[PDB]
Design a protein around this ligand. Sequence first.
Ligand code: HEM
Length: 382
Amino acid sequence: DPAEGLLADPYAVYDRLRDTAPVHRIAGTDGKPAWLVTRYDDVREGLANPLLSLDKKHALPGNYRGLALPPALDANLLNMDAPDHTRIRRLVGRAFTLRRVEQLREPVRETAHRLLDALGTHGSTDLIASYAAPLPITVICDLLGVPDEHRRDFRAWTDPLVTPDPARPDVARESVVSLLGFFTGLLADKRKNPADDLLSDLIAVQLTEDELMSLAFLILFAGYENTVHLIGNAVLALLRHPEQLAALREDPARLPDAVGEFARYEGPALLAIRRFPVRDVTIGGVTVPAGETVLLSLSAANRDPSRFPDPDRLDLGRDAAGHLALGHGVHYCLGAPLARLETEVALAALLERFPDLALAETEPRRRPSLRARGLLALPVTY
Ligand code: HEM
């Protein structure tokens, strides 16, 4: 198999695959067959190809499992095509305009500074547990309007569902149940007494109840793991590239423009959401049968030397315009401006506060995954 070693060395396998097998039939972790696509042109076109459906009603009967969810949560943007997708995305997109997100800038900054306050002046931390993880989940709580007194429960429910322990799935199942009950109650509360928050705004245009519920769940889960690991991956990348770290420490005004190249170089999503051809589709010379499972590799596309010369180099001078880390076409990340704001703010606050930031260890601690590029821990000194 040209894809041997994919779990251990994704980027090395992608280099082999683009040259030898750029649309390659693999076995996924559950052993169901899927098509892995590694070339930039094929991934970009695929993301925008309306014949590649996100709706699993288009999946070959018997061919696709995925995850186990109450059917209210099937009404979600990343299991949906036009016109349904077009309708819901328009309503919620109001929330994430460059200006509505920009107003969160001071509160995001306040949250990040309160997390670093807990580190003191010198010592050691796991930056994932102390900084990269809590920041995005606080921001999501503030955006949705999760009352402060519920946040300890909310965090305890959310953690287990971010990479569910595949040997002990009971905690992850009781987490989904708990959040459904929680969100049902919170929506009722806001319906009876509107507050200044996203869920109160979504209730107003109420959007079926299932659709509201699906937006609460998808904004939570799309908004959490990816943001944690864009931040974490960017810190590791900086601490591994001293000349780049120096460039940013010196001229912090460059951070916003550098976010693009962090995402191209070490974005958190190796793979897009699975897609299903609505009929037989040719992708880079390979006819993929209708209803089969297509995995477009965003990371493989972003490291394609035919689009990004010297792809394995972190270059804050690079034109990273056209990277696919936040997707492309009608499902382009709803959170993109808030993803950008959180990364800018987190990195600027950390660099300003900890001028002696260094890695504690010779080696990163990578989470083994076909779909996620992320760290189990990021031990640093300061
Ligand atoms: C506050 C943070 C975030 C929120 C609330 C958020 C929310 C969402 C939502 C709702 C979608 C689905 C849009 C649709 O189907 O119409 C989406 C898509 C996506 N997001 Fe985000 N996101 C965030 C951060 C990130 C980050 C940091 C990354 C990666 C760097 C990312 C990568 C993606 C990708 C690749 C897609 C498209 C998936 C596909 O087409 O298969 N997101 N996001």
